[PDB]
C-alpha cells in the first residue's frame, strides 16, 4: 500500500521534471552543438574502446568482501540466542577469516594497483 | 492524507536542497574571505529560485553520440532514489516504519551509484567514462566499510529498525560509545555522497566536470538534486545514529527541532571540510580504506561483537 | 489490481530475465538483471520475507556493479549493441517475450496448465498460511541460527571464501 | 647563505612516536586545518559593494 | 491581457538568466589574471550571481580573456558551439577585442568577433577587474532588456 | 502445485536456455548464469518461507554465498582470456580444437 | 624486550593503524572468556520468554512446578531485577 | 559578519522542520490523536486487527474499555 505509492510518487515527479526540462526551453540544435566535448579540439575518437582498470583484482575481491557481509548481517539477531559461546566463536571465525583474506591480499601484492 | 504526508516529505526536502546551494556558496565564500551570493533580494534568498528557473529553461542539448534511453533514465533514477531514501528516517515518527530500515537505505544507496554509472557510460565521452570508473572504485571501497560500520554500530541497537535508535540513545549519545567508528562512518558519508575531499567522480580540476560534463540544463540540475538530497539525508542518518536527541512522546516538535539542528550542524561540517582540504588522488582514497579503514573497522567489529556478551548488555530485539 | 501483485511482479521478473538472456551488450544485460532482481526482491517481500529480499538487492547490486566495471574495461566493443540493433538479439528478445506472453495466456484463463508440472493457478493469496509469529519474525530467527546451529556451514563457507580469494589471486597472477 | 628547507628527521622517543601515532589515528593537523578556516569565517569579508563602492585608484 | 502575461513571463525569465549568469573558465592570457581578481575576495563574482563553471555544456557567458591566436581559434569556435543556447560572449582586453599589441602578427586573429559573435566588448590591456565587472553588469542589463516572448506574441 | 512457482521455474528455464547458447561475448553468458542463480534463490526462498522451515532460511544465503564466488572466478577467467586475447569473444577461442 | 619491544615500537612508529587493529582484535578475542558476565548474558537470553510456558499435567508427584505463577516454587529471576 | 549566512539556514531549518511535524500531526489526525500503532511483529498486527473488529465501526483507533463490556 504505502511503499509502492511512495516509489510511484518519486518516479512520476522525476519523469515530470525531466519532461518540463526537455520540452519547455525551446531548444535549437545543430550538429556541432551536440559534438562530443574533448577540451575543445575534436576527440581522437573512442569513448567505447577498452579502458584498462588496474584494480581489477581489487574490484573483484570487493565482490567476495561484500558477499561476506551477507553472512555477517544476521548478527543483531544472532546475539539473542541461548548458545552465546558458539555464536561468539563463529562470529570471530568469520572476522578472523576476513582478516586473513585481507592480509593475504595485502602481502601478495593484491590491493596494490597494477601498472 | 497519506498523499499529504508524501508531498510534505518531498516539496520541503526539495526546498531545503535548493537553499543548501545558497548556504554552501555563503559559508564557503565566508571561509575564503568573500561574501557569497548577496544581490538577489535580501542576502541572496532568491539565488536558488533564480538558478532553478534558469536550469529548467536553458536548452537541454542531447549529444549526437549519446544513448538517449539511459541518458534520460539516469537522472530519474538518481532523483527518485535520493527522494525515496528519506521515507524511513525516524523523524519523530518515520513515514514508513520498516523493520529493516538500515538495510533498505543501504540497498538504495548502493543503487544510487547506477545513476552515475549509466549517465557516465551513455554520454559517450572520455572524461565521462573515466569518472564512471572512478565512481565504481570509490563506491565499492567505501560501501564495504559502510556495511561493516553499520553492523558494528547497530549491534548495540538490537535490530535494524531506525526508530529504536531513539530508544537506544535515551540517556547518552551513541558517539560516546563508538566514537572511533563514527569518525570512519563520517568519512564514508563524505565519500558515498561523492563529496570532498573524495569528489573525484566530478574532479573539476582534472576531469572538467566528470560524469556531468555532457549533462546540461534540466538533467544536470536533477543530478545536482540527487547529490544534495543525498548530502542532507546522509547527515540526517548520521545524526540519527550517533547524536541522538530527546524525544517527548507528547511533543514530537522538540525532537524535530533537535534533529533538524543536528542535521544542519553535520551539513555545515560537510561544507566546512569541503573548503579546508586538497583533493584525494584516486588510488589514495582506495589505499586509505583497504589498508587503514578496513582493518580498523574489522577489529572494531569484533570488539562490538564481543562487547555486549562480556558485559551482559545484549540489547533487546523488540 | 492489488489482488495478484505477486503475479505481475513475476511477469516483470521474467521480462527482465528475457532482457539479459537475449545476449545484449553486457551493460544492458546488467540493467535487465537489475530490474529482475529488484522485482524478485519485491516478490520475496510480498511472500512474508524481508531480510532475504534486501539481501538479494544489496548482493546483486554489488555483483552487477563489478560486472559493469569489467564490461566497459574488458568486455566492450567500439560499437555496443542494443536490444534492437542486431537481428539476433532482436530475435531472442522477441522469442522470449512472445513465449512468456503465451505461457501466461495459457496460465491465467485455464488455471490448470500441466506444463512440466501441474500448475493450478487460482491465486497466490490462497497458499498463504494462517499463523502467529509472536514477537519474533520467523525469517530473522531462521537466518540468525547460522551462528548457533549451522557451525559446519559457517566453517565451510568461510573456508570457501578464503580459498576463493586465494584462487582469484592465482588465476589473475599472469606469470 | 642557504638553508635546508626539508632536512628534519623526526625524533624516535616513545613520546614522539606516541604523538605521531595519535596525530595519525586522531587526526590532529586536520583539526588545525578546520580551525584555521573557522577562524577566517568569523573574520570580516573583504568584498566591496560595487558599483556603490569602488576600489581605490 | 495576453501582452501583460507574456511581459511578466519575459521579466521572470530575463531576471533568472541575468541573475544566474554562469561564466566559463576560458582564460587565455594576462587578461585572465584580472578575470581571477574579480573572482578574488575584493570584487567577488559570487555575490552578483556569477559562478565560474567549466564544461561549456553548463555555462552561458564566455569571457574571451587573452590573445586569440590562429592555432587556438578552431578550439574557441568549437567550444562556443558546445554551449547550449542562450549564450553570450564577453570580450576582455584589446587582444581579444581587435588584436591588441600583436594586431599585425602572423598567428593572431585580429579580433575574437571574427570567430564568434561577441556580445560585450570590454576594453583594457588588461581591463581593471572593476571594468570587467562593469562589462558583466552591462551584459546583465542587456539580458534584462530582452523581449523574447513579446516578439513571440507579435510573431 | 501453485502458480508463482511456475513463473520462477519458467524464468530459470529461459536462463538455462540462454546460458546454453552463446552469441559473441563472455560477460553475457556469465550474466545469464547469475540469472539462473537468482531464479534458484527466489524459488528456494519461496519454498522455505511457505513451509515455515525456519532452520532452512540460511540456505538461500549460502546459495548467494557460492553464487558470488563462481561469478568472481568466471570473470577472472574472462580477465585472462582478455589478457591473452585482447577481447572476450568465444568464437575466436579455438586454439584447443586440434 | 629487546627484539620484541623494538618491533612493537617500530610498528607503532610506522603503521599505528595495524597495531591498533591487532590490539583491538586480540583483546576482543581473549577477554570474553575471562570476563565473568558472559554467563550472565546467556542467562538473560534464557530469561527472556518468547513462547508461552505451556503448562504440564499435574499427575501429582512433581513439587517444584508451581500451581500458580505467584507461587514461590519454580525458577526466579530476582538476580536480573537487582543486576 | 556571518549573520547574513543565518537566514539561509533559518528558512532551510523551516524546510527540514516541515515534514517532521507534519507526519506526526498526520499520524495524530488520521489515528484519533493517539500515536500510530506500529506492528513490527505479528502479535501487534493481531492486536490491531482485533481492535478493528471490536470497534464495530472498522477503525482500530476507536477504542472501547469498560463501557463496552457488561
Ligand atoms: C528491456 C526492454 C528494451 C526495449 C528496447 O528496445 O529498448 C531500447 C532502448 C533505446 O536504445 P538506444 O541504444 O538508446 O537507441 C535508441 C535509438 O535507436 C537511437 O537514438 P534515437 O535518437 O533514434 O532515439 C529516438 C528513437 C528511439 O526512442 C527513444 O530513444 C525513446 C526512448 C526509448 C523508447 C523505446 O525513436 C524512435 O525510434 C521512434 C519512436 C517512436 O534501450 C534501452 O536500454 C531501453 C530499455 C528500457 C527498459 C525499461 C526501463 C524502465
Ligand atoms: C549561532 C547563532 C546564534 C543566534 C544569533 C546570534 C548572533 O549572531 O547575535 C548577534 C551577534 C553579532 O553578530 P555576529 O555573528 O557576531 O557578526 C557581527 C559582525 O561583527 C558584523 O557586525 P556589524 O559590523 O554589521 O555591526 C553590528 C551588526 C550586528 O549584527 C546583527 O545585529 C545581526 C544579529 C541579528 C540581528 O548589526 C547589523 O549588521 C544588523 C544586520 C542584521 C541582518 C539580519 C541578521 C539575521 C540573523 C538571524 C536571525 C534569526 C534567523 O552575535 C555575536 O556576537 C555572537 C553571539 C553567539 C551566540 C551563540 C548562542 C548559541
Ligand atoms: C597559470 O596560468 C593560468 C592561466 O593563465 C592564462 C589561466 O588562464 C587559467 C584558467 C583560468 C581560470 C580557471 C579562471 C579563474 C577561475 C577561478 C578562480 C574560479 C573561481 C570560482 C568561483 C568564484 C566560484 C566557485 C564556486 C563555489 C564556491 C560554489 C559552487 C556551488 C554551487 C552549488 C553553485 C550553484 C549551482 C547549482 C546547480 C545550484 C542551483 C540549483 C538549484 C537551486 C535547483 C533548485 C530547484 C528547485 C527548488 C526545484 C523545486 C521543485 C519543486 C518544489 C517541485 C517540482 C515538481 C514538479 C512536478 C514541477 C589558469 C587556471 C591558470 O592557472
Ligand atoms: C517555469 C518557467 C515559466 C516561464 C517559461 C518560459 C519559457 C521560454 C522559452 C523561450 C521562448 C520560446 C517561446 O515561447 O517562443 C519562442 C519564440 C519564437 O518566435 P520567433 O519566430 O522569433 O522564433 C525565434 C527564432 N528561431 C526560430 C530561430 C529560434 O522566440 C523567442 O521567444 C526568442 C526570440
Ligand atoms: S589585451 Fe593586453 S592584457 Fe589583454 S591579452 Fe592582449 S596584451 Fe594581454
Amino acid at each position: 500500500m504505502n511503499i509502492m505509492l511512495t516509489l510511484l510518487t518519486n518516479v512520476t515527479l522525476a519523469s515530470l521534471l525531466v519532461l518540463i526540462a526537455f520540452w519547455l526551453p525551446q531548444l535549437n540544435a545543430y550538429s556541432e552543438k551536440t559534438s562530443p566535448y574533448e577540451c575543445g579540439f575534436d576527440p581522437m575518437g573512442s569513448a567505447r574502446l577498452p579502458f584498462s582498470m588496474k584494480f581489477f583484482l581489487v574490484a573483484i575481491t570487493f565482490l567476495l568482501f561484500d558477499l561476506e557481509i551477507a553472512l555477517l548481517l544476521p548478527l543483531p539477531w544472532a546475539s539473542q540466542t541461548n548458545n552465546l559461546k558458539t555464536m561468539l566463536t563463529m562470529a570471530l571465525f568469520l572476522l578472523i577469516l576476513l582478516a586473513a583474506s585481507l592480509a593475504y591480499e595485502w602481502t601478495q601484492k593484491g590491493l596494490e594497483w597494477a601498472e | 492524507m497519506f498523499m499529504i504526508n508524501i508531498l510534505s516529505l518531498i516539496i520541503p526536502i526539495l526546498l531545503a536542497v535548493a537553499f543548501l546551494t545558497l548556504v554552501e556558496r555563503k559559508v564557503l565564500g565566508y571561509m575564503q574571505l568573500r561574501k557569497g551570493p548577496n544581490v538577489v533580494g535580501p542576502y541572496g534568498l532568491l539565488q536558488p529560485i533564480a538558478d532553478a528557473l534558469k536550469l529548467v529553461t536553458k536548452e537541454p542539448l542531447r549529444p549526437g553520440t549519446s544513448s538517449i534511453s539511459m541518458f534520460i533514465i539516469a537522472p530519474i533514477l538518481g532523483l527518485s532514489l535520493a527522494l525515496t531514501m528519506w521515507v524511513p528516517l525516524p523523524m519523530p515518527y518515520p513515514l514508513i516504519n520498516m523493520n529493516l530500515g538500515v538495510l533498505f537505505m543501504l540497498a538504495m544507496s548502493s543503487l544510487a551509484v547506477y545513476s552515475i554509472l549509466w549517465s557516465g557510460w551513455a554520454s559517450n565521452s572520455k572524461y565521462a567514462l573515466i569518472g564512471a570508473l572512478r565512481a565504481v572504485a570509490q563506491t565499492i571501497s567505501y560501501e564495504v566499510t559502510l556495511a561493516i560500520i553499520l553492523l558494528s554500530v547497530l549491534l548495540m541497537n538490537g535490530s535494524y529498525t531506525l526508530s529504536t535508535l531513539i530508544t537506544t540513545q535515551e540517556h547518552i549519545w551513541m558517539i560516546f560509545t563508538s566514537w572511533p567508528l563514527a569518525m570512519m562512518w563520517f568519512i564514508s558519508t563524505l565519500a558515498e555522497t561523492n563529496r570532498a575531499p573524495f569528489d573525484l567522480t566530478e574532479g573539476e580540476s582534472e576531469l572538467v566536470s566528470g560524469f556531468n560534463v555532457e549533462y546540461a540544463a534540466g538533467p544536470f540540475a536533477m543530478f545536482f538534486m540527487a547529490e544534495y538530497a543525498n548530502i542532507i539525508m546522509m547527515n540526517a542518518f548520521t545524526a540519527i545514529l550517533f547524536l541522538g536527541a530527546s524525544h517527548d512522546p507528547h511533543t514530537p516538535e522538540l525532537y524535530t527541532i533537535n534533529f533538524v539542528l543536528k542535521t544542519l550542524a553535520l551539513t555545515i561540517t560537510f561544507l566546512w571540510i569541503r573548503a579546508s582540504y586538497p583533493r584525494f588522488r584516486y588510488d589514495q582514497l582506495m589505499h586509505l580504506l583497504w589498508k587503514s579503514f578496513l582493518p580498523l573497522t574489522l577489529a572494531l567489529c569484533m570488539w562490538h561483537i564481543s562487547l555486549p556478551i562480556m558485559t551482559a548488555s545484549i540489547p533487546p530485539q523488540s | 489490481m492489488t489482488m495478484y501483485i505477486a503475479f505481475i511482479l513475476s511477469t516483470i521478473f521474467v521480462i527482465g530475465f528475457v532482457g539479459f538472456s537475449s545476449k545484449p551488450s553486457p551493460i544492458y544485460g546488467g540493467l535487465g538483471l537489475i530490474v529482475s532482481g529488484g522485482v524478485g526482491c519485491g516478490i520475496v517481500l510480498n511472500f512474508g520475507g524481508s531480510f532475504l529480499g534486501l539481501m538479494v538487492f544489496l548482493i546483486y547490486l554489488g555483483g552487477m556493479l563489478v560486472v559493469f566495471g569489467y564490461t566497459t574495461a574488458m568486455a566492450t566493443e567500439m560499437y555496443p549493441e542494443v536490444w534492437v540493433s542486431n537481428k539476433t538479439v532482436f530475435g531472442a528478445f522477441v522469442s522470449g517475450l512472445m513465449m512468456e506472453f503465451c505461457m501466461v495466456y495459457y496460465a491465467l484463463k485455464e488455471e490448470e496448465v500441466e506444463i512440466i508440472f501441474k500448475f493450478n493457478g487460482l491465486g497466490d493469496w490462497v497458499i498463504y498460511d494462517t499463523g502467529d509469529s509472536g514477537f519474533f519474525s520467523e525469517e530473522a530467527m531462521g537466518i540468525a541460527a547460522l551462528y548457533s546451529y549451522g557451525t559446519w556451514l559457517v566453517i565451510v563457507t568461510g573456508w570457501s571464501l578464503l580459498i576463493g580469494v586465494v584462487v582469484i589471486m592465482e588465476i589473475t597472477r599472469g606469470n | 647563505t642557504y638553508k635546508f628547507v626539508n632536512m628534519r628527521e623526526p625524533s624516535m622517543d616513545m613520546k614522539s612516536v606516541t604523538d605521531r601515532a595519535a596525530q595519525t589515528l586522531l587526526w590532529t593537523e586536520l583539526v588545525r586545518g578546520l580551525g584555521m578556516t573557522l577562524s577566517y569565517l568569523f573574520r570580516e569579508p573583504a568584498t566591496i559593494n560595487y558599483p556603490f563602492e569602488k576600489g581605490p585608484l | 491581457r495576453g501582452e501583460y502575461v507574456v511581459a511578466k513571463l519575459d521579466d521572470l525569465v530575463n531576471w533568472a538568466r541575468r541573475s544566474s549568469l554562469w561564466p566559463m573558465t576560458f582564460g587565455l592570457a594576462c587578461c585572465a589574471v584580472e578575470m581571477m581578481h574579480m573572482a578574488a575576495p575584493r570584487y567577488d563574482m559570487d555575490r552578483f550571481g556569477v559562478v565560474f563553471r567549466a564544461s561549456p555544456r553548463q555555462s552561458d557567458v564566455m569571457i574571451v580573456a587573452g590573445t586569440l591566436t590562429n592555432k587556438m581559434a578552431p578550439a574557441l569556435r568549437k567550444v562556443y558551439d558546445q554551449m547550449p543556447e542562450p549564450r553570450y560572449v564577453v570580450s576582455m582586453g584589446s587582444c581579444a577585442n581587435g588584436g591588441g599589441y600583436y594586431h599585425y602578427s602572423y598567428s593572431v586573429v585580429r579580433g575574437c568577433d571574427r570567430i564568434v559573435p561577441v556580445d560585450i566588448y570590454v576594453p583594457g590591456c588588461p581591463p581593471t577587474a572593476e571594468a570587467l565587472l562593469y562589462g558583466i553588469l552591462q551584459l546583465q542589463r542587456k539580458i534584462k532588456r530582452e523581449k523574447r516572448l513579446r516578439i513571440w506574441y507579435r510573431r | 502445485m501453485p502458480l508463482v512457482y511456475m513463473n520462477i521455474i519458467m524464468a530459470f528455464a529461459i536462463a538455462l536456455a540462454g546460458l546454453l547458447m552463446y552469441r559473441s561475448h563472455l560477460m553475457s553468458s556469465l550474466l545469464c548464469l547469475e540469472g539462473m542463480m537468482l531464479s534458484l534463490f527466489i524459488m528456494s526462498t519461496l519454498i522455505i518461507l511457505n513451509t515455515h522451515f525456519t532452520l532452512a532460511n540460511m540456505m538461500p544465503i549460502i546459495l548467494l554465498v557460492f553464487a558470488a564466488c563462481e561469478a568472481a572466478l568466471g570473470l577472472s577467467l574472462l580477465v585472462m582470456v582478455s589478457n591473452t586475447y585482447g577481447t572476450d569473444y568465444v568464437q575466436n577461442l579455438n586454439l584447443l580444437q586440434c | 624486550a629487546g627484539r620484541i619491544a623494538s618491533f612493537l615500537k617500530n610498528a607503532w612508529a610506522k603503521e599505528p593503524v595495524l597495531v591498533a587493529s591487532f590490539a583491538i582484535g586480540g583483546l576482543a578475542i581473549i577477554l570474553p572468556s575471562l570476563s565473568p558476565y558472559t554467563n550472565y548474558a546467556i542467562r538473560i537470553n534464557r530469561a527472556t520468554p518468547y513462547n508461552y510456558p505451556v503448562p504440564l499435567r499435574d499427575d501429582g508427584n512433581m513439587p517444584d512446578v508451581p500451581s500458580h505463577p505467584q507461587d514461590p516454587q519454580g525458577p526466579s529471576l530476582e538476580w536480573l531485577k537487582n543486576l | 559578519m556571518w549573520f547574513e549566512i543565518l537566514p539561509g539556514i533559518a528558512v532551510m531549518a523551516a524546510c527540514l522542520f516541515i515534514p517532521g511535524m507534519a507526519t506526526a500531526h498526520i499520524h495524530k489526525f488520521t489515528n484519533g490523536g493517539k500515536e500510530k500503532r506500529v506492528a513490527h511483529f505479528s502479535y501487534q498486527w493481531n492486536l490491531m486487527e482485533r481492535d478493528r473488529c471490536i470497534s464495530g465501526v472498522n477503525r482500530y483507533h476507536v477504542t472501547k474499555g469498560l463501557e463496552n463490556i457488561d
Side-chain angles (χ1 to χ4, degrees), chain B residues 7-207:
Chain B
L7 291 187
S8 84
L9 194 50
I10 285 179
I11 308 303
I13 292 308
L14 290 171
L15 286 195
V17 168
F19 289 122
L20 208 278
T21 77
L22 181 284
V23 308
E24 158 183 327
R25 292 158 62 171
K26 290 227 61 174
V27 163
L28 260 68
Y30 258 101
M31 305 279 144
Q32 338 175 16
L33 214 64
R34 302 206 326 281
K35 201 167 284 176
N38 193 16
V39 161
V40 282
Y43 315 145
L45 288 167
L46 278 275
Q47 209 75 6
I49 286 290
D51 42 37
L53 259 281
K54 169 159 110 63
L55 291 168
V56 301
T57 181
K58 201 234 179 242
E59 157 191 25
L61 93 175
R62 169 164 79 65
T65 57
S66 34
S67 192
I68 154 198
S69 153
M70 254 179 247
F71 193 88
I72 296 320
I73 209 190
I76 300 141
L77 196 289
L79 186 48
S80 34
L81 302 196
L83 248 56
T84 320
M85 163 169 336
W86 274 86
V87 316
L89 290 182
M91 293 160 21
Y93 315 141
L95 167 67
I96 303 303
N97 198 301
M98 263 180 330
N99 253 345
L100 281 317
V102 170
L103 261 38
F104 164 87
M105 292 153 62
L106 280 149
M108 327 286 311
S109 162
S110 102
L111 212 156
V113 79
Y114 272 174
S115 72
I116 321 192
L117 228 56
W118 295 342
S119 68
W121 177 80
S123 35
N124 250 316
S125 180
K126 313 227 204 92
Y127 293 109
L129 201 293
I130 290 162
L133 301 214
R134 320 172 112 217
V136 167
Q138 164 168 345
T139 87
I140 56 108
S141 59
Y142 294 118
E143 214 140 56
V144 187
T145 48
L146 212 80
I148 264 52
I149 285 155
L150 277 194
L151 202 164
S152 290
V153 167
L154 291 155
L155 270 182
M156 312 290 272
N157 196 2
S159 96
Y160 294 100
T161 75
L162 278 196
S163 170
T164 85
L165 285 157
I166 291 127
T167 317
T168 304
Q169 319 149 86
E170 186 89 293
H171 306 307
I172 178 152
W173 287 351
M174 167 135 291
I175 205 170
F176 295 129
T177 315
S178 312
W179 76 261
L181 289 141
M183 315 209 299
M184 272 164 291
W185 166 259
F186 188 82
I187 304 309
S188 345
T189 63
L190 280 176
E192 286 322 353
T193 46
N194 253 353
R195 256 289 281 251
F198 311 97
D199 46 34
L200 276 156
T201 179
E202 297 96 7
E204 186 101 355
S205 324
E206 74 270 9
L207 248 59

Side-chain angles (χ1 to χ4, degrees), chain B residues 43, chain D residues 44, chain H residues 1-4 6-7 10:
Chain B
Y43 315 145
Chain D
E44 179 130 322
Chain H
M1 292 319 337
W2 30 249
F3 45 74
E4 285 170 46
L6 253 308

Side-chain angles (χ1 to χ4, degrees), chain E residues 29-31 65-67 92-96 99-102 124-127:
Chain E
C30 37
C31 279
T67 295
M92 182 157 351
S94 53
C95 278
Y101 213 155
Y102 334 93
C125 184

Side-chain angles (χ1 to χ4, degrees), chain C residues 29-110:
Chain C
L31 164 153
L33 197 114
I34 276 296
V35 32
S36 75
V39 307
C41 156
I43 303 175
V44 169
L45 277 173
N46 209 108
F47 253 107
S50 293
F51 184 83
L52 281 356
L54 299 143
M55 264 320 94
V56 154
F57 219 136
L58 215 164
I59 269 65
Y60 263 11
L61 272 69
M64 294 336 320
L65 177 153
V66 96
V67 145
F68 168 100
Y70 260 50
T71 283
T72 186
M74 264 58 271
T76 191
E77 49 260 85
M78 192 297 246
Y79 263 66
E81 256 161 323
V82 207
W83 277 296
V84 86
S85 275
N86 191 304
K87 263 33 185 182
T88 299
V89 297
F90 201 3
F93 213 170
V94 154
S95 66
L97 292 174
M98 296 69 278
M99 168 161 96
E100 165 76 299
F101 174 27
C102 66
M103 328 330 280
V104 302
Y105 195 169
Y106 192 24
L108 53 90
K109 344 293 271 183
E110 307 59 14

Side-chain angles (χ1 to χ4, degrees), chain A residues 28 30 32-37 40-42, chain E residues 57 71 75 78-79 81-85 87:
Chain A
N28 163 276
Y30 53 63
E32 325 68 35
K33 170 181 245 73
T34 103
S35 167
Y37 168 44
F41 290 123
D42 176 71
Chain E
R57 256 41 191 271
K71 202 173 182 177
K78 143 54 58 60
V79 148
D81 271 346
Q82 272 57 2
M83 281 198 228
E85 291 203 280
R87 34 189 210 207

